[PDB]
Amino acid sequence: ASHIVGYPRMGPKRELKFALESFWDGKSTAEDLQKVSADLRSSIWKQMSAAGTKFIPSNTFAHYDQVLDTTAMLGAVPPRYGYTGGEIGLDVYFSMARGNASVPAMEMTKWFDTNYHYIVPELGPEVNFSYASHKAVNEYKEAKALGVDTVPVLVGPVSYLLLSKAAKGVDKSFELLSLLPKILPIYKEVITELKAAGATWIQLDEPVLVMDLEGQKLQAFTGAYAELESTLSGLNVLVETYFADIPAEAYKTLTSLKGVTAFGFDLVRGTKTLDLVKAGFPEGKYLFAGVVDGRNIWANDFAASLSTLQALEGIVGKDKLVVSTSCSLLHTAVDLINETKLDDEIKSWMAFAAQKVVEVNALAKALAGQKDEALFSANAAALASRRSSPRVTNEGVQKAAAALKGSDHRRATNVSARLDAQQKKLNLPILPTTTIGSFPQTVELREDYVKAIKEEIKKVVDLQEELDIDVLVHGEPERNDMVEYFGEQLSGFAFTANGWVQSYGSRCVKPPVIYGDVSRPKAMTVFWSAMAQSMTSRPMKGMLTGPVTILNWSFVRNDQPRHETCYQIALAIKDEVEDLEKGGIGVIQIDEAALREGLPLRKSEHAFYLDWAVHSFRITNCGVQDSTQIHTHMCYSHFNDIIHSIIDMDADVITIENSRSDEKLLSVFREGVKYGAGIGPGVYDIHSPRIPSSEEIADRVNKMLAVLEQNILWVNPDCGLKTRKYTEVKPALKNMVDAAKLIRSQ
Ligand code: MET
Ligand SMILES: [Zn+2]
Ligand SMILES: [Zn+2]
């Protein structure tokens, strides 16, 4: 038997994205959206069915988010939406998902360690739960009619609570898990209709079990399933798990849950769990082996997988071993078939969701004795060509092996003394001003060199007249994407044509692919930066994306450790920095927008990650002169549990997010830490179209100075200005400078 934990819902050509966007804009009706939604589900179901898949998921589809889906199922909609009961529909749902003309939307946050984001439930003692959404039972019946029996998928009740947050005005004493008695009854009613409709298997996703849970919390699972047992009667129940291995204790709780007959394990990212399985697996329960990675873009290693599956068969296998994916295919691309530019060889190394369903099935048939010798042979050949291709391996291995030469701190020179030499070259005033990089993109089109120059001189001429601004940027008018801009000029990269992944709601991202050893063949930024730094006598800063960010926002190769790859990236950037230095650029900015995105779920695995992440960053400029000032930008406003790592980065100046945060929190730097380097906490929210005033900005800078030393404090925005309009940035920036200049006089 074969199984799939979940499936992408945007469609092979992002059909749902445009349908949702058409509907949201009012250019299509509710029915039109439903028609696109139903056809998409029918297509997905029949696709998996024709493939031989036995456990086909239903309810994986979502108009916006799976968690928001369960929120509608529990009728837990926030007070401000003025919902008054009854079956929840598009209105209320999208209203929670994106807000409306008079009410803000619910918060959205990162789903475990993926690049997907869910809507966070706002729970409290005052919420009156109710079965307000029959999405699951409907989908089950819909698929039934189409002729494909499915396995309904629900976010487990206790994972749902642990993923929520207390609503405003809810005492801190309150404990979410205290709501179980209120939501469990609803799960009962949903499971009852599912059984009545004919479902014989049901899937409960309890991914929180892969987290580090205290004994008290694990106990909550136990009680929940004990309370659900009688309802789960006469039904096979699969509790799913993914993204990491299951903690020893968590494994005891899980393998002894009442009513549960099957267990889903991520064996790509949580292979460690195998140890516990070998130590002891329940009597006659099913084990769903997620051996096909649904988190990446590579073709599966059939040989290896079979070897693993067969061993598990020994542990149970008497028809109790089901081949599955490591996690929902939601986190991978839809169909490789639609990649028509990538050469056949690189494609042979790949596999998207559609191909992964075939893989799970090929493995399942192979285990049943009906091995398709033609599939395994083609796979063996592909894996071989990849493992021997020169495109993959390069003498970058030479440079790579050397970084073992201990750390890579910039030539001793403490940052404080280093700052002195830089100030010698940059006669900057107190509280200097500068921006983060990009500027509003004007007209633009699809020679070109000259067309780009004009736009820069305009940003430079603007920056100069514009409140002066002590340190200038070029606006990045020649860049379309932070990462792709550099990936297109690096070695081990390849770019997909239609491999989109859902990021959240309707927004998708098409991650670059790093298939082999990376190296920078030619200069990438020196031309444009040198050109910008000539149109002004003011300091022009260089613009590069850290190696960590490039790594995190790419489908990274799975044939070597991530850090190993991250260093190859660092090495290549290392050149550009030193090329910008020889070019004359005396100030170089390296933004690590996604420094924290690769944080492991296992808490004890954190330190290791932060280590190579930061190292990678240092490697980037460890060989720069002491007069060369280096800036690092980071899209975050909470560093309390990662502060020491920011320090070990050893940047001359760092700019973070701040302007919606309580300035008093900046004491995290000057306390038991003593930073002693440049720091520029945002003072202008670039995500809002409103213009802050010199009064407000100046006010924030003073409250800020209340904690930080005026001699290392910079004045700049929250982030780039790409998404803003010149009509909002111009007056905004002018206020920022007036505030500074003023504070300067005082
Ligand atoms: C998202 S981090 C900032 C990237 C780039 N320097 C900008 O200003 O947009
Ligand atoms: Zn940013
Ligand atoms: Zn340290």
Swiss-Prot record:
Pfam families with a match to the protein in the record: Meth_synt_1, Meth_synt_2
Lineage: Eukaryota, Viridiplantae, Streptophyta, Embryophyta, Tracheophyta
Positions that bind L-homocysteine: 436-438, 591
Source organism: Arabidopsis thaliana (Mouse-ear cress)
Gene transcribed to yield this protein: MS1
InterPro entries in alphabetical order: Cbl-indep_Met_Synth_N, Cobalamin-indep_Met_synthase, Met_Synth_C/arc, UROD/MetE-like_sf
Record's subcellular location: Cytoplasm, Cytosol
CDD domains the UniProt entry points to: CIMS_C_terminal_like, CIMS_N_terminal_like
Sites where the protein binds L-methionine: 436-438, 476, 591
GO biological process, any: methylation
Pathway named in the protein's UniProt entry: Amino-acid biosynthesis; L-methionine biosynthesis via de novo pathway; L-methionine from L-homocysteine (MetE route): step 1/1
Free-text remark on how the cofactor is bound: Binds 2 Zn(2+) ions per subunit.
Cofactor(s) for this UniProt protein: Zn(2+)
UniProt-annotated binding residues for Zn(2+) 1: 633, 635, 657, 719
Protein family: Belongs to the vitamin-B12 independent methionine synthase family.
NCBIfam families, alphabetized: met_syn_B12ind (TIGR01371), PRK05222.1 (NF003556)
Entry GO MF terms: 5-methyltetrahydropteroyltriglutamate-homocysteine S-methyltransferase activity; copper ion binding; methionine synthase activity; mRNA binding; zinc ion binding
Name the UniProt record assigns to this protein: 5-methyltetrahydropteroyltriglutamate--homocysteine methyltransferase 1
Gene3D superfamilies to which the protein is assigned, alphabetical: 3.20.20.210
Keywords tagged on the record: Amino-acid biosynthesis, Cytoplasm, Metal-binding, Methionine biosynthesis, Methyltransferase, Transferase, Zinc
Binding site for 5-methyltetrahydropteroyltri-L-glutamate: 17, 115, 507-508, 553
Active site: residue positions: 687 (proton donor)
Enzyme class, spelled out: transferase
Residues binding Zn(2+) 2: 644, 648
GO cellular component: apoplast; chloroplast; chloroplast stroma; cytosol; peroxisome; plant-type vacuole; plasma membrane; plasmodesma
Reactions accelerated catalytically: 5-methyltetrahydropteroyltri-L-glutamate + L-homocysteine = tetrahydropteroyltri-L-glutamate + L-methionine
